[PDB]
Amino acid sequence: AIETETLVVGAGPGGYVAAIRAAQLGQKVTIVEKGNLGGVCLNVGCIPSKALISASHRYEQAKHSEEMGIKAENVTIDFAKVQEWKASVVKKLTGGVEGLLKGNKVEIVKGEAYFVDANTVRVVNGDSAQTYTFKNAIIATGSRPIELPNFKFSNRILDSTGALNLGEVPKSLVVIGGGYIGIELGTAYANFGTKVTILEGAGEILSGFEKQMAAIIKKRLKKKGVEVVTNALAKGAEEREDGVTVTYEANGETKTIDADYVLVTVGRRPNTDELGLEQIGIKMTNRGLIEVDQQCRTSVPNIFAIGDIVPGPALAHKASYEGKVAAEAIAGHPSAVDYVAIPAVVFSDPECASVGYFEQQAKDEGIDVIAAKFPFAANGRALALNDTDGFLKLVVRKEDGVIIGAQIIGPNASDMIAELGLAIEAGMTAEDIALTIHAHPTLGEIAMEAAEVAL
Amino acid sequence: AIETETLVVGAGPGGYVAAIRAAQLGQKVTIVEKGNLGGVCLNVGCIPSKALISASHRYEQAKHSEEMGIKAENVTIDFAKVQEWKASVVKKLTGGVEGLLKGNKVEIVKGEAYFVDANTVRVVNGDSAQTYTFKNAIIATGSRPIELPNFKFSNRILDSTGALNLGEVPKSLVVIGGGYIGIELGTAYANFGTKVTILEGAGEILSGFEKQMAAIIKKRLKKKGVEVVTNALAKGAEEREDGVTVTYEANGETKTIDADYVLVTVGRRPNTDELGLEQIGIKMTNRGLIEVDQQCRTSVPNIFAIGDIVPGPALAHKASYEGKVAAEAIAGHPSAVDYVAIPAVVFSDPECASVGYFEQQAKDEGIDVIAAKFPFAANGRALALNDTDGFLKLVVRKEDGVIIGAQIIGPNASDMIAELGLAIEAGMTAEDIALTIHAHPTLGEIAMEAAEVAL
Amino acid sequence: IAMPSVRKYAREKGVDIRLVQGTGKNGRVLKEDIDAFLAGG
Ligand SMILES: Cc1cc2nc3c(=O)[nH]c(=O)nc-3n(C[C@H](O)[C@H](O)[C@H](O)COP(=O)(O)OP(=O)(O)OC[C@H]3O[C@@H](n4cnc5c(N)ncnc54)[C@H](O)[C@@H]3O)c2cc1C
Ligand SMILES: Cc1cc2nc3c(=O)[nH]c(=O)nc-3n(C[C@H](O)[C@H](O)[C@H](O)COP(=O)(O)OP(=O)(O)OC[C@H]3O[C@@H](n4cnc5c(N)ncnc54)[C@H](O)[C@@H]3O)c2cc1C
C-alpha cells in the first residue's frame, strides 16, 4: 500500500486548488485524476464554450454591422481553424494547472479512485491497481451530463462535450433543454448559421433568471432564426445515417423536426456513484449530492467534499472556493464557506449575470426590498455599441438601502457585475454607489445612474 | 427685465444636470445656450467620438479575424452611412436633454450670455438683446480647442470637431498631439485605412498614463502602419489648397510631410474670456480657470462655476458632479465636492482606464506603496477574446492594504475600472477585493487575482 | 477611510469627519461613529 497525508480525488477547479492550498499549508498531498488535469472547466466546460461563443460573435458581427455602414460580402468560417484555435487555448490553461501542481510538489496520480474503507482508496489504471491509505481526503469528482433513455448519446445525439467538438457547422441542430449550457451552445451555432430549435419542457427558458431577462434573450434569438418551444415534451429520435428525426409533443400536438444533430442538455448528475461512498457511510442528499458542513466535511470527518457534488450553484468558483476552505479546515486553520454571494453569468447574445437576491427570492424570504432598473437604451456607450437591448436591476433592502442583489442583461454584463458584486459583499448602500463617479461614457456609468433611481 | 432665480449659463453635462438638480430643489431655473443643448460632450465630444471609434473597430475586426477562421471578402465602408448613423445617436441623446429640461420645466434661452453685473446678464441673439435678472448664477461655459500659432484652422487644418465631421475617409492624416483625443481620432482613422502620422512634442504619447501602457498602445499603432514621431516640434503647415505640408523639427532634423488633412489636438482652453467676469470681480487664474471653493463658488457669492472652466480633470462627469453640488449648495443643502478619485478612460485599441494614483505619483507623494501587476495573458476569457496584450495594476498603501490607484490596459478596461473605482472611493483593501468571489471566466475577475497577488 | 455615504452623513450633520470616532473594524469611521461624536457629545 502507499501512505499519504491528504488525498485529493479530482483535478478540476476544486480538486487542484485544494491540492495546491493543502501543499502550501505544509501538508503532503497526492492528487488522483483519471483523465486530463483541469477537469470539466478547462477541457470540456467554461473555456471551450466561451472560446466557441467568442468566435461565433466575431462572425455575428462581421456579417451584421450593416447599420454602421460596414458591408461585408461573403463572410466565411473555417471551422477547422476555429477548433484548432480552441484547442491551443485549452492546452495553454491545462499546461498551466499541470505546472501549478508540480510547483507545489503534489504527487499527481493517473488512475480511477475508489474508497475501500473510510481511510483507504484503491486506484486503478491499466491492469494495475495501487492502494493508498490517507490521513485526510477531499472528494472533488464533479458531475456529468444526464443520458436520457430514448436519447442515449450517439454519433448524432450529443452532450455538451460532443457539440463542442463538432468538425463542421451543422445545418440544423435541435437542443433539448434551455438552461445556460443549452442556450449558450444553441446561440453559438445559431451565429454560425445553424438553424436551431430549443425545446424546454417548462414554461420558460433560463430557469433561475427573471422572466424579463429570458424575454430579451428570446426576442433576439428569434431574430437570429432560432425557434423556442416551451412546455415541449421530447419523445425520442429515429437516427438516420445522415441526420436525426426528433419527435416531441408541444401543447397537445405531436410534431417532428429533422436535424443534423440533437443536443441533450437537460442537466448534470454528480459523480458520486460506484465510488464506495455508499459503503463507507457517506449520507447523500435526495439529488445524489453529498451533504457537508460549513467546512465541506462529509459524514466521515476525515472526508470532505467540494464543487459540483456538493449543494449550491455548480460553478467553477464555488468549487475553487470550497476547495480552499476544505484544506484550511484540514490544516486546523479556522475557516468556513461563509461567502456573501457567487455571481452567475450566461454568455447569451445579450450577456446575462446576477449576484445576490432576485427581487422574488428576497420578497418571498420576507425581505423588504425596492427594485431599481435602468435601461441600456438611455446610455451613450450602449448607443455607441449599437446594442440598446438590456437593463440593470438593483434590489436594495428598503430598511437601510443596503444592496442585496443585482441583475444585468446587456453588453459586458459579465464584467459590469464585478462592481455590484463587491458592493453586495461590502454591504454598501445604493447611495454609496450613486455618490461614486463612474467613467464616461461607459456601460458601468449605468450602475451609478441606477442607484440614482433607487433614491 | 425678465426676472429669474437661478440662471445657468451653458447646457453641457455640467450645465443641464445643474439646471436640473436646482429645479428639483424648487429653484426657478433659466438656462442659456448659444448653440445646441448637451454641449460639447453630446454634439462634438464624447458621443460622436466613441461612435466613430465603434464603427472603426467593427471595420478592423471584420477585415481581421483571420486567426479565428473568419474570412470575409470585399468589406466595404460607407462613411456617409457611418456619419448618418453617428448623427442619429447624437440627435437621439440631444432630444433626451431637451426633454429632461422641459420635463423639469427649466426655462431654456438661446443666446450668447454676457455678465452686465453681479446680478444681471444680457443675452444677445443676433440683433436681439434681452436682459435677465437673477438671484444666483452657475457658469458652465466649458472649453474650446487651442489653435497652434502657424496652424490656422481651416477645412484642411482641423480641430477634433473637424475630424469628427469628415465627409470621407482621408487618404492620409497628420495628428499633432498624442493625447487621448489625438490617439482616439488617430486610431479610428487608422482603422478605416488612413495613413496616420502622430507627432507628439513630449517623449511619449498618452502623457498622463504609465509609459508601460503607452508602450503597448504604440506597439499596436505600429502594427497598423501608424508612424509615431515623439519629441517632435511642429513648426507650421502650408495648405497646398489640395492637401497640407507640415514642417516639424525632430532630433535637429527639420522635415516636411504631406497629408490630405492635419488634425491639431494640442489642448483646450477655458471659455472664460469675453464673458465680463473680470469686471464682475470673479477671481481667475492666469490660464483662465476660475478660482472656486468646495461648493463651486466664485469670488462673487451668488456666482458658481463648474466644468472645464474650473480646476480638475477635463471630464464630463467631473462637470456633472459639480453641477449637482452647485444647485444643492444654492438650495441650502450643505453640499461640497467630496470624491477620492475620478476614473479616466481612453478608447485606444487596447482600451485603457486609470483611477487614483499611478505607482510613481504615489511614492513621489511620499507614500510607501506596493504595486501588483496581473496579465490578461493568464486570464481565460482574454484568451477566448484572443486579445491578450494588457494588464491590471493595483497601487496599494503598504501601511494598511488600502487601494489608492488602479490601471487597466486591455479589453473592456473602461467597464472593469468601475469595480476598482468603487473600492478606492470607499477605502477598501486588497483583501476586501480578494475575498470577493468574481465571475469565471470573465475579465473583471483579474482584479481578484491581482489583489491575491498583492496579498 | 470611509464610504461616500458616511462622509455625506457627517456633511449634512455638520460634523468634522477629519476628527470623528474611528470605530475600528476596518479602521474606518461609520455612520454611528458620526452619531457618537454628535449625539454623544
Ligand atoms: C460545457 C459546460 C459549460 C460550463 N460552463 C461554466 C461556466 O462558464 N462557468 C462556471 O462556473 N461553470 C461552468 N460549467 C460547470 C463547471 O465546469 C463546473 O462547475 C466545475 O468544473 C466544477 O469543478 P469540480 O472540480 O467540482 O469538477 P470537475 O471539473 O468535473 O473535475 C472533476 C474531476 O474529477 C475527475 N474524477 C472523477 N472521478 C474520478 C475518479 N474516480 N478518480 C480520479 N479522478 C476522478 C474527473 O476526471 C475530473 O477531471 C460548465 C460545464 C459544462 C459541461
Ligand atoms: C473629442 C473629445 C472627446 C472627449 N472625450 C471625453 C470622454 O470620452 N469622456 C469625458 O468625460 N469627457 C470627454 N471630453 C470632454 C468633455 O466634452 C467635457 O469635459 C465636457 O463636455 C465638459 O462639459 P461642460 O458642461 O463643462 O462644458 P461643455 O460641454 O463644453 O458645454 C458648455 C456650453 O456652454 C455654451 N456656452 C459657452 N459660453 C456661452 C455663453 N457665454 N453663452 C451661452 N452659451 C455659452 C457652449 O455652447 C456649450 O454648449 C471630450 C472632449 C472632446 C472635444
XYZ file of N, CA, C and O in Angstrom, chain B residues 102-235:
536
model
N -37.204 70.513 -20.296
C -38.617 70.853 -20.409
C -39.478 70.098 -19.386
O -40.356 70.683 -18.749
N -39.194 68.809 -19.213
C -39.930 67.989 -18.267
C -39.816 68.567 -16.870
O -40.795 68.619 -16.130
N -38.617 69.007 -16.506
C -38.404 69.604 -15.196
C -38.772 71.083 -15.259
O -38.566 71.825 -14.299
N -39.315 71.493 -16.404
C -39.731 72.867 -16.666
C -38.668 73.941 -16.460
O -38.926 74.979 -15.845
N -37.473 73.687 -16.980
C -36.373 74.636 -16.889
C -36.550 75.575 -18.079
O -36.859 75.126 -19.187
N -36.420 76.876 -17.836
C -36.560 77.882 -18.888
C -35.316 77.817 -19.778
O -34.198 77.963 -19.291
N -35.501 77.554 -21.066
C -34.366 77.473 -21.985
C -34.263 78.740 -22.846
O -35.205 79.095 -23.557
N -33.118 79.415 -22.773
C -32.880 80.642 -23.531
C -31.739 80.463 -24.523
O -30.618 80.127 -24.137
N -32.014 80.720 -25.793
C -30.993 80.594 -26.822
C -30.277 81.933 -26.957
O -30.917 82.959 -27.197
N -28.960 81.933 -26.777
C -28.206 83.165 -26.901
C -26.846 83.166 -26.234
O -26.533 82.307 -25.409
N -26.034 84.150 -26.595
C -24.701 84.301 -26.042
C -24.861 85.178 -24.806
O -25.225 86.348 -24.926
N -24.664 84.597 -23.624
C -24.809 85.339 -22.372
C -23.599 86.188 -22.072
O -22.464 85.787 -22.341
N -23.858 87.347 -21.480
C -22.823 88.307 -21.127
C -23.185 88.875 -19.758
O -24.326 89.279 -19.533
N -22.229 88.879 -18.839
C -22.487 89.382 -17.500
C -22.339 90.892 -17.415
O -21.239 91.421 -17.550
N -23.468 91.573 -17.218
C -23.509 93.032 -17.108
C -23.068 93.415 -15.698
O -22.409 94.430 -15.498
N -23.463 92.611 -14.718
C -23.070 92.834 -13.333
C -23.306 91.573 -12.522
O -23.807 90.577 -13.047
N -22.989 91.638 -11.234
C -23.127 90.501 -10.332
C -24.525 89.907 -10.168
O -24.687 88.909 -9.474
N -25.527 90.500 -10.807
C -26.901 90.011 -10.700
C -27.649 90.159 -12.014
O -28.856 89.908 -12.085
N -26.928 90.503 -13.072
C -27.578 90.702 -14.355
C -26.734 90.235 -15.529
O -25.507 90.376 -15.521
N -27.402 89.658 -16.522
C -26.748 89.187 -17.734
C -27.647 89.508 -18.902
O -28.869 89.415 -18.804
N -27.047 89.943 -19.991
C -27.824 90.235 -21.172
C -27.417 89.159 -22.157
O -26.267 88.716 -22.148
N -28.383 88.634 -22.898
C -28.082 87.605 -23.876
C -28.396 88.166 -25.255
O -29.460 88.752 -25.485
N -27.421 88.072 -26.145
C -27.589 88.585 -27.488
C -27.890 87.460 -28.446
O -27.113 86.511 -28.572
N -29.035 87.548 -29.098
C -29.424 86.537 -30.059
C -29.478 87.262 -31.389
O -30.532 87.730 -31.822
N -28.315 87.401 -32.010
C -28.236 88.110 -33.270
C -28.375 89.589 -32.957
O -27.668 90.113 -32.096
N -29.307 90.258 -33.624
C -29.531 91.677 -33.382
C -30.361 91.866 -32.117
O -30.595 92.989 -31.678
N -30.790 90.755 -31.530
C -31.587 90.776 -30.313
C -30.697 90.809 -29.069
O -29.578 90.292 -29.078
N -31.217 91.407 -28.003
C -30.508 91.513 -26.741
C -31.542 91.674 -25.637
O -32.237 92.683 -25.575
N -31.658 90.660 -24.787
C -32.619 90.657 -23.687
C -31.835 90.702 -22.386
O -30.667 90.317 -22.351
N -32.480 91.110 -21.303
C -31.770 91.185 -20.038
C -32.451 90.377 -18.938
O -33.604 90.636 -18.572
N -31.724 89.397 -18.418
C -32.225 88.518 -17.380
C -31.617 88.850 -16.035
O -30.395 88.855 -15.870
N -32.483 89.164 -15.084
C -32.053 89.491 -13.738
C -32.180 88.191 -12.946
O -33.221 87.525 -13.013
N -31.140 87.835 -12.197
C -31.147 86.592 -11.429
C -30.695 86.767 -9.989
O -30.127 87.798 -9.633
N -30.926 85.741 -9.176
C -30.521 85.765 -7.779
C -29.105 85.213 -7.701
O -28.188 85.851 -7.174
N -28.940 84.007 -8.224
C -27.644 83.346 -8.251
C -27.501 82.731 -9.623
O -28.503 82.459 -10.292
N -26.259 82.563 -10.062
C -25.980 82.013 -11.374
C -24.879 80.962 -11.320
O -24.046 80.967 -10.405
N -24.905 80.051 -12.293
C -23.921 78.979 -12.419
C -23.319 79.110 -13.818
O -24.040 79.071 -14.817
N -22.010 79.320 -13.891
C -21.333 79.458 -15.170
C -20.696 78.121 -15.534
O -19.782 77.645 -14.844
N -21.195 77.509 -16.602
C -20.674 76.230 -17.076
C -20.417 76.376 -18.565
O -20.971 75.635 -19.371
N -19.542 77.316 -18.913
C -19.221 77.621 -20.301
C -18.316 76.652 -21.059
O -18.180 76.752 -22.284
N -17.709 75.710 -20.342
C -16.873 74.715 -20.988
C -15.557 75.190 -21.552
O -14.998 76.167 -21.069
N -15.060 74.511 -22.578
C -13.782 74.877 -23.162
C -13.821 74.777 -24.667
O -14.837 74.401 -25.236
N -12.693 75.074 -25.300
C -12.580 75.030 -26.749
C -11.139 74.717 -27.151
O -10.214 74.861 -26.348
N -10.929 74.269 -28.400
C -9.589 73.929 -28.893
C -8.573 75.073 -28.916
O -8.925 76.243 -29.097
N -7.311 74.714 -28.712
C -6.215 75.663 -28.760
C -5.812 75.676 -30.231
O -5.750 74.614 -30.856
N -5.655 76.862 -30.813
C -5.219 76.964 -32.203
C -3.716 77.212 -32.145
O -3.273 78.177 -31.526
N -2.936 76.307 -32.724
C -1.482 76.430 -32.733
C -1.098 77.625 -33.614
O -1.722 77.855 -34.654
N -0.055 78.391 -33.214
C 0.467 79.578 -33.899
C 0.484 79.578 -35.417
O -0.137 80.446 -36.033
N 1.188 78.638 -36.036
C 1.217 78.614 -37.503
C 0.292 77.582 -38.150
O 0.445 77.245 -39.327
N -0.672 77.093 -37.377
C -1.628 76.111 -37.855
C -3.028 76.696 -37.745
O -3.810 76.325 -36.871
N -3.326 77.643 -38.622
C -4.629 78.286 -38.630
C -5.686 77.319 -39.142
O -5.599 76.819 -40.268
N -6.672 77.054 -38.297
C -7.763 76.158 -38.637
C -8.476 76.556 -39.928
O -8.703 77.738 -40.214
N -8.806 75.541 -40.707
C -9.494 75.702 -41.970
C -10.126 74.342 -42.241
O -10.127 73.471 -41.370
N -10.653 74.145 -43.442
C -11.263 72.864 -43.771
C -10.225 71.752 -43.968
O -10.590 70.593 -44.162
N -8.939 72.099 -43.924
C -7.877 71.096 -44.053
C -7.000 70.991 -42.817
O -6.283 70.007 -42.639
N -7.048 72.018 -41.974
C -6.313 72.017 -40.715
C -7.435 72.024 -39.683
O -8.010 73.061 -39.334
N -7.793 70.807 -39.293
C -8.885 70.517 -38.378
C -8.617 70.536 -36.890
O -7.482 70.426 -36.425
N -9.711 70.631 -36.157
C -9.705 70.541 -34.710
C -10.526 69.255 -34.532
O -11.109 68.768 -35.510
N -10.564 68.686 -33.329
C -11.308 67.444 -33.096
C -12.652 67.411 -33.828
O -12.942 66.464 -34.564
N -13.422 68.485 -33.680
C -14.724 68.623 -34.326
C -14.654 68.497 -35.851
O -15.530 67.908 -36.483
N -13.602 69.038 -36.442
C -13.462 68.953 -37.880
C -13.272 67.518 -38.328
O -13.825 67.119 -39.345
N -12.501 66.740 -37.571
C -12.242 65.344 -37.916
C -13.488 64.476 -37.731
O -13.743 63.557 -38.507
N -14.275 64.777 -36.708
C -15.492 64.020 -36.455
C -16.513 64.209 -37.569
O -17.395 63.376 -37.755
N -16.408 65.305 -38.307
C -17.371 65.566 -39.368
C -16.847 65.366 -40.773
O -17.490 65.777 -41.741
N -15.696 64.722 -40.902
C -15.128 64.491 -42.219
C -16.131 63.744 -43.094
O -16.801 62.817 -42.639
N -16.268 64.189 -44.337
C -17.202 63.553 -45.245
C -16.712 62.246 -45.835
O -17.486 61.468 -46.391
N -15.419 61.998 -45.722
C -14.856 60.784 -46.268
C -13.619 60.371 -45.505
O -13.099 61.126 -44.689
N -13.187 59.141 -45.724
C -12.004 58.637 -45.063
C -10.798 59.196 -45.805
O -10.596 58.923 -46.980
N -10.027 60.059 -45.139
C -8.829 60.701 -45.687
C -7.792 59.695 -46.163
O -7.624 58.639 -45.561
N -7.072 60.027 -47.224
C -6.048 59.123 -47.710
C -4.934 59.120 -46.666
O -4.313 58.092 -46.394
N -4.708 60.272 -46.054
C -3.675 60.392 -45.042
C -4.006 61.545 -44.113
O -4.581 62.557 -44.542
N -3.645 61.379 -42.844
C -3.900 62.376 -41.815
C -2.686 62.527 -40.890
O -2.060 61.531 -40.520
N -2.325 63.768 -40.559
C -1.213 64.021 -39.633
C -1.835 64.549 -38.341
O -2.494 65.591 -38.354
N -1.652 63.816 -37.243
C -2.192 64.199 -35.939
C -1.122 64.883 -35.077
O -0.109 64.281 -34.720
N -1.339 66.150 -34.762
C -0.407 66.897 -33.935
C -0.916 66.905 -32.494
O -1.852 67.637 -32.152
N -0.315 66.067 -31.658
C -0.725 65.994 -30.271
C -1.147 64.592 -29.909
O -2.253 64.189 -30.225
N -0.269 63.846 -29.251
C -0.590 62.484 -28.868
C -1.313 62.301 -27.537
O -0.841 61.556 -26.682
N -2.440 62.979 -27.343
C -3.207 62.830 -26.110
C -4.375 61.887 -26.349
O -4.501 61.353 -27.452
N -5.265 61.706 -25.374
C -6.380 60.784 -25.585
C -7.183 61.149 -26.831
O -7.435 60.296 -27.674
N -7.503 62.426 -26.998
C -8.244 62.848 -28.176
C -7.440 62.582 -29.444
O -7.976 62.082 -30.421
N -6.150 62.883 -29.419
C -5.325 62.651 -30.594
C -5.156 61.179 -30.906
O -5.168 60.775 -32.065
N -5.020 60.371 -29.866
C -4.860 58.933 -30.014
C -6.160 58.249 -30.453
O -6.125 57.330 -31.268
N -7.301 58.709 -29.934
C -8.609 58.141 -30.287
C -8.991 58.410 -31.739
O -9.339 57.489 -32.472
N -8.940 59.671 -32.158
C -9.279 60.014 -33.536
C -8.254 59.478 -34.516
O -8.606 59.082 -35.620
N -6.996 59.422 -34.093
C -5.946 58.907 -34.947
C -6.131 57.419 -35.193
O -6.063 56.969 -36.335
N -6.385 56.654 -34.134
C -6.585 55.208 -34.246
C -7.827 54.860 -35.074
O -7.792 53.953 -35.922
N -8.924 55.568 -34.820
C -10.154 55.326 -35.550
C -9.854 55.422 -37.037
O -10.068 54.466 -37.781
N -9.280 56.533 -37.473
C -8.973 56.654 -38.891
C -7.937 55.645 -39.349
O -7.956 55.216 -40.507
N -7.067 55.218 -38.441
C -6.072 54.216 -38.789
C -6.830 52.916 -39.044
O -6.434 52.113 -39.885
N -7.948 52.731 -38.342
C -8.769 51.536 -38.521
C -9.459 51.554 -39.885
O -9.559 50.523 -40.539
N -9.940 52.722 -40.311
C -10.629 52.850 -41.595
C -9.694 52.729 -42.793
O -10.150 52.672 -43.932
N -8.388 52.761 -42.548
C -7.442 52.648 -43.642
C -6.544 53.843 -43.926
O -5.649 53.733 -44.753
N -6.745 54.962 -43.236
C -5.936 56.171 -43.442
C -4.463 56.057 -42.997
O -4.154 55.435 -41.978
N -3.555 56.663 -43.755
C -2.149 56.648 -43.376
C -2.069 57.736 -42.303
O -2.267 58.917 -42.604
N -1.826 57.339 -41.058
C -1.766 58.286 -39.950
C -0.384 58.455 -39.344
O 0.325 57.478 -39.105
N 0.005 59.706 -39.126
C 1.290 60.018 -38.518
C 0.973 60.872 -37.319
O 0.259 61.866 -37.447
N 1.475 60.474 -36.157
C 1.238 61.225 -34.933
C 2.528 61.930 -34.560
O 3.605 61.347 -34.661
N 2.424 63.210 -34.227
C 3.585 63.983 -33.835
C 3.375 64.483 -32.409
O 2.494 65.313 -32.176
N 4.098 63.915 -31.442
C 3.983 64.367 -30.051
C 5.261 65.093 -29.665
O 6.367 64.631 -29.963
N 5.091 66.246 -29.027
C 6.223 67.047 -28.598
C 6.992 66.416 -27.459
O 8.207 66.555 -27.367
N 6.265 65.735 -26.582
C 6.855 65.064 -25.437
C 7.593 63.817 -25.891
O 7.632 63.498 -27.079
N 8.151 63.097 -24.924
C 8.890 61.887 -25.222
C 7.994 60.685 -25.393
O 8.414 59.675 -25.958
N 6.761 60.785 -24.905
C 5.811 59.687 -25.020
C 4.380 60.174 -25.175
O 3.996 61.203 -24.612
N 3.615 59.449 -25.985
C 2.209 59.755 -26.210
C 1.489 59.366 -24.925
O 2.055 58.657 -24.091
N 0.239 59.797 -24.786
C -0.564 59.499 -23.600
C 0.208 59.899 -22.350
O 0.357 59.116 -21.411
N 0.654 61.151 -22.344
C 1.437 61.729 -21.255
C 0.970 61.433 -19.824
O 1.788 61.145 -18.950
N -0.334 61.507 -19.582
C -0.837 61.252 -18.242
C -0.980 59.797 -17.813
O -1.551 59.533 -16.760
N -0.476 58.854 -18.607
C -0.581 57.437 -18.270
C 0.796 56.785 -18.206
O 1.766 57.299 -18.768
N 0.876 55.650 -17.520
C 2.134 54.928 -17.383
C 2.777 54.671 -18.735
O 2.091 54.334 -19.702
N 4.102 54.758 -18.777
C 4.857 54.531 -20.003
C 4.639 53.110 -20.513
O 4.680 52.865 -21.719
N 4.407 52.180 -19.593
C 4.163 50.793 -19.968
C 2.894 50.683 -20.800
O 2.875 50.017 -21.837
N 1.829 51.323 -20.322
C 0.542 51.303 -21.010
C 0.686 51.876 -22.409
O 0.237 51.269 -23.385
N 1.361 53.018 -22.508
C 1.582 53.664 -23.794
C 2.392 52.772 -24.732
O 2.078 52.668 -25.918
N 3.404 52.093 -24.192
C 4.266 51.219 -24.989
C 3.453 50.183 -25.754
O 3.704 49.925 -26.931
N 2.450 49.626 -25.088
C 1.579 48.626 -25.685
C 0.704 49.256 -26.772
O 0.589 48.731 -27.883
N 0.113 50.398 -26.452
C -0.746 51.103 -27.392
C 0.025 51.523 -28.637
O -0.490 51.410 -29.758
N 1.281 51.920 -28.448
C 2.139 52.353 -29.550
C 2.501 51.166 -30.430
O 2.468 51.254 -31.662
N 2.810 50.049 -29.776
C 3.177 48.806 -30.447
C 2.067 48.341 -31.393
O 2.342 47.764 -32.443
N 0.815 48.586 -31.017
C -0.305 48.212 -31.869
C -0.516 49.233 -32.973
O -1.006 48.888 -34.052
N -0.173 50.493 -32.701
C -0.301 51.532 -33.714
C 0.689 51.179 -34.819
O 0.331 51.140 -35.999
N 1.911 50.837 -34.421
C 2.943 50.449 -35.371
C 2.446 49.295 -36.235
O 2.604 49.319 -37.450
N 1.822 48.301 -35.606
C 1.282 47.148 -36.327
C 0.339 47.631 -37.418
O 0.309 47.075 -38.511
N -0.410 48.687 -37.117
C -1.362 49.259 -38.056
C -0.749 50.143 -39.137
O -1.456 50.611 -40.030
N 0.544 50.417 -39.042
C 1.169 51.270 -40.038
C 1.111 52.735 -39.651
O 1.171 53.627 -40.503
N 0.950 52.982 -38.356
C 0.905 54.336 -37.825
C 2.338 54.712 -37.454
O 3.052 53.934 -36.821
N 2.784 55.875 -37.900
C 4.128 56.302 -37.585
C 4.008 57.304 -36.453
O 3.359 58.343 -36.600
N 4.578 56.966 -35.303
C 4.528 57.853 -34.153
C 5.870 58.541 -33.970
O 6.873 57.885 -33.680
N 5.881 59.859 -34.151
C 7.086 60.660 -34.010
C 7.038 61.458 -32.699
O 6.333 62.466 -32.594
N 7.749 60.973 -31.688
C 7.803 61.637 -30.387
C 8.947 62.656 -30.370
O 9.829 62.622 -31.235
N 8.948 63.536 -29.372
C 9.984 64.565 -29.237
C 10.081 65.383 -30.520
O 11.169 65.775 -30.949
N 8.937 65.602 -31.151
C 8.893 66.359 -32.385
C 8.347 67.746 -32.093
O 7.561 67.927 -31.169
N 8.780 68.732 -32.861
C 8.301 70.087 -32.675
C 7.651 70.482 -33.990
O 8.307 70.500 -35.028
N 6.341 70.706 -33.961
C 5.611 71.081 -35.165
C 5.823 72.556 -35.372
O 5.568 73.345 -34.472
N 6.281 72.932 -36.556
C 6.553 74.334 -36.839
C 5.503 75.067 -37.648
O 5.278 76.262 -37.443
